[PDB]
Enzyme design. Structure first.
Site, PDB file in Angstrom:
ATOM      1  N   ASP A   1       4.808 -45.751  -2.907  1.00 46.75           N
ATOM      2  CA  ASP A   1       4.941 -44.483  -2.207  1.00 46.75           C
ATOM      3  C   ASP A   1       3.695 -44.111  -1.463  1.00 46.75           C
ATOM      4  O   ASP A   1       3.371 -42.938  -1.376  1.00 46.75           O
ATOM      5  CB  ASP A   1       5.395 -43.360  -3.160  1.00 46.75           C
TER       6      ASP A   1
ATOM      7  N   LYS B   1       1.443 -42.989   1.462  1.00 45.94           N
ATOM      8  CA  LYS B   1       1.578 -42.187   2.675  1.00 45.94           C
ATOM      9  C   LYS B   1       0.445 -41.161   2.623  1.00 45.94           C
ATOM     10  O   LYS B   1      -0.066 -40.914   1.523  1.00 45.94           O
ATOM     11  CB  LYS B   1       2.955 -41.497   2.781  1.00 45.94           C
TER      12      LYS B   1
ATOM     13  N   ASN C   1       0.349 -38.491  -0.215  1.00 47.66           N
ATOM     14  CA  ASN C   1       0.136 -38.945  -1.582  1.00 47.66           C
ATOM     15  C   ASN C   1      -1.322 -39.301  -1.852  1.00 47.66           C
ATOM     16  O   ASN C   1      -1.624 -39.901  -2.877  1.00 47.66           O
ATOM     17  CB  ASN C   1       1.107 -40.112  -1.879  1.00 47.66           C
TER      18      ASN C   1
ATOM     19  N   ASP D   1       1.146 -39.331  -6.481  1.00 46.57           N
ATOM     20  CA  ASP D   1       2.572 -39.277  -6.871  1.00 46.57           C
ATOM     21  C   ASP D   1       3.089 -40.655  -7.332  1.00 46.57           C
ATOM     22  O   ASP D   1       3.118 -41.590  -6.533  1.00 46.57           O
ATOM     23  CB  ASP D   1       3.391 -38.727  -5.676  1.00 46.57           C
TER      24      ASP D   1
ATOM     25  N   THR E   1       9.092 -43.774   1.659  1.00 44.80           N
ATOM     26  CA  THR E   1       9.232 -42.858   2.801  1.00 44.80           C
ATOM     27  C   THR E   1       9.641 -43.726   3.995  1.00 44.80           C
ATOM     28  O   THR E   1       9.082 -44.816   4.144  1.00 44.80           O
ATOM     29  CB  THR E   1       7.949 -42.053   2.950  1.00 44.80           C
TER      30      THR E   1
HETATM   31  N1  LIG Z   1      -3.673 -33.236  -9.415  1.00 42.83           N
HETATM   32  C1  LIG Z   1      -3.533 -32.381  -8.404  1.00 42.83           C
HETATM   33  N2  LIG Z   1      -4.602 -31.635  -8.036  1.00 42.83           N
HETATM   34  C2  LIG Z   1      -4.459 -30.757  -7.033  1.00 42.83           C
HETATM   35  N3  LIG Z   1      -3.371 -30.495  -6.298  1.00 42.83           N
HETATM   36  C3  LIG Z   1      -2.328 -31.247  -6.687  1.00 42.83           C
HETATM   37  C4  LIG Z   1      -2.320 -32.185  -7.710  1.00 42.83           C
HETATM   38  N4  LIG Z   1      -1.069 -32.774  -7.825  1.00 42.83           N
HETATM   39  C5  LIG Z   1      -0.363 -32.191  -6.884  1.00 42.83           C
HETATM   40  N5  LIG Z   1      -1.057 -31.254  -6.162  1.00 42.83           N
HETATM   41  C6  LIG Z   1      -0.576 -30.448  -5.042  1.00 42.83           C
HETATM   42  O1  LIG Z   1       0.607 -29.769  -5.431  1.00 42.83           O
HETATM   43  C7  LIG Z   1       1.683 -30.117  -4.532  1.00 42.83           C
HETATM   44  C8  LIG Z   1       3.001 -30.024  -5.266  1.00 42.83           C
HETATM   45  O2  LIG Z   1       3.773 -31.224  -5.075  1.00 42.83           O
HETATM   46  P1  LIG Z   1       4.439 -32.143  -6.204  1.00 42.83           P
HETATM   47  O3  LIG Z   1       3.489 -33.096  -6.840  1.00 42.83           O
HETATM   48  O4  LIG Z   1       5.278 -31.210  -7.093  1.00 42.83           O
HETATM   49  O5  LIG Z   1       5.450 -32.928  -5.258  1.00 42.83           O
HETATM   50  P2  LIG Z   1       5.458 -33.196  -3.687  1.00 42.83           P
HETATM   51  O6  LIG Z   1       4.171 -33.716  -3.181  1.00 42.83           O
HETATM   52  O7  LIG Z   1       5.908 -31.894  -2.998  1.00 42.83           O
HETATM   53  O8  LIG Z   1       6.640 -34.255  -3.561  1.00 42.83           O
HETATM   54  P3  LIG Z   1       8.230 -34.162  -3.463  1.00 42.83           P
HETATM   55  O9  LIG Z   1       8.665 -32.780  -3.043  1.00 42.83           O
HETATM   56  O10 LIG Z   1       8.598 -35.266  -2.448  1.00 42.83           O
HETATM   57  O11 LIG Z   1       8.777 -34.572  -4.848  1.00 42.83           O
HETATM   58  C9  LIG Z   1       1.265 -31.471  -3.969  1.00 42.83           C
HETATM   59  O12 LIG Z   1       1.921 -31.799  -2.745  1.00 42.83           O
HETATM   60  C10 LIG Z   1      -0.238 -31.255  -3.782  1.00 42.83           C
HETATM   61  O13 LIG Z   1      -0.498 -30.419  -2.661  1.00 42.83           O
END
Ligand SMILES: Nc1ncnc2c1ncn2[C@@H]1O[C@H](COP(=O)(O)OP(=O)(O)OP(=O)(O)O)[C@@H](O)[C@H]1O
Ligand SMILES: Nc1nc2c(ncn2[C@@H]2O[C@@H]3COP(=O)(O)O[C@H]3[C@H]2O)c(=O)[nH]1
Length: 454
Positions: free
Chosen positions: A282, A284, A287, A300, A319
């Protein structure tokens, strides 16, 4: 001048050690003559941390304890015990003008002590040999200390501070320990009901297993998870520098040197995952997340999988812009699908757009299948960058750089990486291209506005 019988005993002992076994007879005789056989009693410090050092040691009898104090007002950490055939003391002869740990005799010990000049003239050096002979005991010691600290926590020890982001299946909150307000984490909260309904029970299980078991400075840490009646909680490392996709959107595109630093962070995360038989799938810009220093980490692991060595996996995922042709064609894939994605990443970081892009996913897949040679590269892509992109995005997985004889070393040794400091990156001393502004452990300003083992 050395007694013949004793000179021959050292020669025999040095041949029994794999590290020195392949040295020529004349060198082994010089070492056997120049060395000093020193005996130590149980409890003696062979080496004291902080002291100046100009000697290397090979244990010929007994065992020693290696300890290291992080701060002066801190607990000495046990690193490892060394025994007969092991060696130590080379770090102060190779970049530190200071002993970096204590070496204490743990019984009656005998060391064959070699001076700095003899160490360089005869042995040559262990700059490439000490990294491979011994694993990272400091990392292991830190993970053991962290594992004990995290095992003793409960959901009641945390305060919610702010929201980092909201994804399709859960919210990521910035959390803080009530007792140690300076210590903040990213807590991913997932609704159990939502995981069942979207059929992601295996994706969540796999994501926890891989992330929690991964110990890499280029991969966001999952310290542990908690669970209650309706939710799953994933305690992760908070990376407050922001997401690489927002930084790219703001700047438009990254310069060659900037892209190189971020691609190297990915190469390190892939070298780590691929050595464990794990495929990421994944990659991109969304991530890749920057910590407060500007170091990028993979975040991710929903499509990641432990597939082992010499075998393929069959699931369509990723993606549309980053997915490899054998994934699109559902013909099976292995870790070389990750090297394809790395080429896509380099191209998108340098230009702001991925190479293959249609108005919808189906069109994008068709453009990917025509291949990288039908894409007009903007003249801003350097010839060495273009060359590495084209070696990574080979249609035949077998021909991809990273998947040849020397694995990931072939990527690391490419002309585009000439003069890139891989050790400084691995050590954290290399200066990132973008220094994020993080006002405190609670600054979220760089972000925009089956369950039994959990
Ligand atoms: N360890 C981390 N430290 C800081 N910010 C984080 C961390 N992990 C995630 N985030 C932030 O929180 C957001 C919430 O996204 P999450 O990991 O729930 O899924 P996503 O990136 O939106 O993917 P999808 O919607 O495709 O499942 C991330 O996109 C990132 O901006
Ligand atoms: N810093 C460090 N030194 C170690 C470790 N394990 C063994 N040692 C040895 O302990 C020695 C102490 O002196 P040096 O710093 O010169 O070189 C060190 C290493 O050769 C480890 O995990 N960390």
């Amino acid at each position: 001048s050395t007694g013949l019988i004793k000179h021959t005993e050292y020669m025999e002992f040095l041949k029994s050690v794999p590290t020195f076994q392949s040295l020529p007879e004349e060198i082994l005789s010089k070492l056997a003559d120049v060395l000093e056989e020193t005996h130590y009693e149980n409890g003696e410090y062979i080496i004291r941390q902080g002291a100046r050092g100009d000697t290397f040691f090979i244990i010929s009898k007994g065992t020693v304890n290696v300890t290291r104090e992080d701060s002066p007002s801190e607990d000495p950490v046990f690193l490892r015990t060394l025994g007969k055939g092991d060696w130590f003391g080379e770090k102060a002869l190779q970049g530190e003008d200071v002993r970096t740990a204590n070496v204490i005799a743990a019984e009656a010990v005998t060391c064959l002590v070699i001076d700095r000049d003899s160490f360089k003239h005869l042995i040559g050096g262990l700059d490439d040999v000490s990294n491979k002979a011994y694993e990272d005991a400091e990392a292991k010691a830190k993970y053991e200390a962290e594992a004990a600290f995290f095992a003793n926590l409960k959901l009641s020890d945390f305060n919610i501070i702010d929201t980092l982001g909201v994804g399709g299946f859960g919210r990521v909150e910035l959390v803080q320990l009530k007792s140690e307000e300076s210590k903040t984490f990213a807590m991913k909260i997932l609704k159990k009901r939502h995981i069942v309904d979207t059929r992601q029970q295996e994706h969540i299980r796999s994501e926890k297993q891989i992330m929690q078991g991964a110990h890499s400075d280029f991969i966001v840490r999952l310290y542990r998870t908690f669970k209650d009646s309706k939710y799953l909680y994933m305690l992760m490392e908070a990376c407050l520098g922001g997401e690489l996709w927002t930084i790219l959107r703001d700047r438009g595109s990254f310069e060659d040197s900037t892209t190189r630093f971020y691609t190297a962070c990915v190469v390190e995360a892939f070298a780590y995952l691929h050595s464990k038989g794990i495929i990421y799938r994944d990659l991109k810009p969304e991530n890749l997340i920057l910590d407060h220093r500007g170091y990028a980490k993979l975040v991710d692991f929903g499509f990641a999988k432990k597939i082992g060595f010499g075998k393929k996996t069959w699931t369509f995922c990723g993606t549309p812009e980053y997915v490899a042709p054998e994934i699109i064609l559902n013909k099976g894939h292995d870790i070389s699908a990750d090297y394809w994605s790395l080429g896509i990443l380099m191209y998108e970081l340098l230009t702001g757009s991925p190479p293959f892009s249609g108005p919808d996913p189906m069109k994008t897949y068709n453009i990917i299948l025509r291949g990288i040679d039908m894409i007009e590269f903007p003249k801003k892509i350097a010839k060495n960058a273009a060359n590495l992109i084209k070696k990574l995005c080979r249609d035949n997985p077998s021909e991809r750089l990273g998947n040849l004889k020397n694995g990931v070393k072939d990527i690391q040794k490419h002309k585009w990486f000439e003069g890139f400091n891989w050790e400084g990156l691995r050590k954290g001393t290399l200066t990132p291209p973008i220094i994020p502004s993080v006002a405190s452990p609670t600054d979220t300003s760089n972000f925009d506005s089956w369950d039994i083992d959990f």
